[PDB]
């Protein structure tokens with residue numbers, strides 16, 4: 511595990527997407543932008559994304575899909591009314607910077623705080639909703655699936671505590687969602703693309719005072735979850751076994767993504783230190799649809 515700092519002075523980095531050339535496109539939630547970090551050290555702003563760009567994934571159209579949580583109040587906190595503009599799913603042209611809003615509601619219900627997302631092999635899009643905190647109450651968590659072609663959005667999970675990281679198993683027959691305040695990883699069986707069958711179960715619950723953020727899946731099927739408070743990556747086997755915890759040096763470790771040769775480099779956002787780092791990983795990551803395969 512040779513650790514290297516790839517970029518600093520990032521304004522709450524999140525949603526890293528590691529390109530084939532080893533460049534990283536990621537979100538800066540606090541600076542409300544999508545940023546490109548190159549291996550020669552240089553950085554460029556790809557697009558301004560007003561609100562709270564929170565997670566990213568490259569889509570089948572070659573555009574970068576964004577979970578926009580609508581904005582926080584700044585370490586993030588509950589958004590004062592004016593700092594919140596509504597949650598949405600958006601799309602950014604990585605060549606022009608054009609931002610288009612795709613969904614801001616499901617049925618008659620506005621999206622609250624979209625957080626992270628993952629494409630299935632047909633181009634369908636899974637995403638989590640962390641909800642928003644208000645003065646005296648908070649939204650429940652949820653997970654949604656947008657049908658291939660961006661034709662329809664559906665609610666698949668609803669009524670958990672806030673949900674954050676999301677991924678698919680290698681065979682894409684299981685969707686994983688990380689429940690933030692409990693440090694529990696939930697697994698949901700899929701009867702087919704975009705459809706949970708009964709709705710799921712927690713396969714791992716960490717002890718102590720540990721919370722979960724975003725995640726990335728390994729080719730082995732292990733789920734690698736950014737772990738807040740204790741500041742590490744928690745590697746969880748498909749059967750729920752805690753395989754290992756890799757310290758990162760930041761209590762606000764928020765996301766991980768695999769790239770580099772054989773997808774054996776982990777790219778991690780340390781959102782407390784404002785850093786993007788890279789770390790050797792003993793096992794290869796799961797190739798993401800429309801990015802790595």
Ligand SMILES: C[C@H]1CCC(O)(O)O1
Nearest residue numbers: 524586625674723764
């Ligand atoms: C504190 C929450 C909001 C952004 C995050 O990284 O998903 O975690």
Ligand SMILES: [Ca+2]
Nearest residue numbers: 626674723724
């Ligand atoms: Ca997240």
Ligand code: NA
Nearest residue numbers: 725726766767
């Ligand atoms: Na990730």
